[PDB]
Scaffold this active site. Structure first.
Site: not given
Ligand SMILES: O=c1[nH]c(=O)c2ncn([C@@H]3O[C@H](CO)[C@@H](O)[C@H]3O)c2[nH]1
Ligand SMILES: [Zn+2]
Ligand SMILES: O=c1[nH]c(=O)c2ncn([C@@H]3O[C@H](CO)[C@@H](O)[C@H]3O)c2[nH]1
Ligand SMILES: [Zn+2]
Lengths: 157, 157
Positions: A52, A54, A82, A85
């Site tokens: 991700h 972060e 998320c 992260c």
């Molecule tokens: O923290 C996150 N960083 C990402 O790059 C990322 N890419 C996808 N997701 C998804 O977006 C939603 C909102 O946080 C959740 O389904 C994450 O897993 C992300 N969440």
């Molecule tokens: Zn994440």
């Protein structure tokens, strides 16, 4: 300060979906107004579901600073981090989190309904005292629009 | 064959402590009884606070299989995965988690009180659905012993 680095994270989100590197998420790690890492989601480029935005920024910052703690640094996330992260942010000892869009704005375009209890203060076991700011006004409205804007430009993961 | 793979993750924990790679944690990811990845904590080796045993094993399994989801695989962790790792386990779609020691075993020797609500069943915004087994008997005894055997053999983080 906060508008500029949040905006940088939003721009990273657009850059990454345009690269095909991953989804529309960006993160910027700053050390007393010096940018340490500026990254976006790399899940597709790296074949790594942990990459991700972060987590990628934390990895890069720590390597650049030769330290596993980022306690003098702050992180700007284009979207609410998320649970993974948020856990990474906790482990890295970042002192402040600023994020732009609520998780619901990503969930609205099909991302998993996957939200960090500790960020929202809803845990029994996991607490956080991390200083957290949800941006409002201008930068926030821009950040929330990312998902509608990039919907048709990448494949969900 | 749960005991075999849990024992291999505990072995990884000891090996990584002995290497100086990181703390006493291992993880093994398996496909239908064949090991896809075998890893331990690499936080010190990589100067990466995200490189827990579980995240490291997920990254390696996703590379080995050339894909970002492991829905046919199961993961064996020597210790209860933390909120970051349990988030990564969610995102990777691993279908089952077997873990050896309760988090308190690791907290008892110096690691943060940093526990995954969603693993323990107290999550509100994070809802796991993978199958989770906490090892009993001999598996538990081996996994808990790791923390007594490796006390003051490694640098805390
Ligand atoms: O923290 C996150 N960083 C990402 O790059 C990322 N890419 C996808 N997701 C998804 O977006 C939603 C909102 O946080 C959740 O389904 C994450 O897993 C992300 N969440
Ligand atoms: Zn994440
Ligand atoms: O899931 C984890 N994998 C690790 O490698 C690891 N290394 C240290 N810790 C810490 O041990 C405690 C119990 O889960 C928490 O403080 C973890 O961050 C770890 N948790
Ligand atoms: Zn972990």
């Amino acid at each position: 300060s906060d508008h500029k680095f949040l905006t940088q994270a939003v721009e990273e989100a657009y850059k990454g979906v345009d690269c095909g590197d991953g989804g529309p998420f960006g993160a910027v790690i700053v050390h007393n107004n010096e940018v340490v890492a500026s990254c976006h989601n790399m899940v597709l480029k790296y074949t790594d579901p942990t990459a991700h935005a972060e987590v990628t920024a934390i990895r890069e910052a720590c390597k650049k600073l030769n330290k596993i703690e980022l306690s003098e640094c702050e992180i700007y996330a284009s979207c609410e981090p998320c649970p993974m992260c948020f856990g990474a942010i906790h482990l890295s000892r970042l002192k402040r989190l600023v994020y732009g869009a609520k998780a619901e704005a990503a969930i609205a375009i099909g991302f998993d309904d996957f939200i960090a209890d500790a960020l929202r203060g809803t845990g029994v076991y996991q607490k956080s005292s991390l200083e957290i700011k949800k941006a409002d006004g201008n930068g926030a409205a821009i950040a929330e629009q990312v998902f509608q804007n990039t919907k048709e430009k990448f494949r969900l993961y």
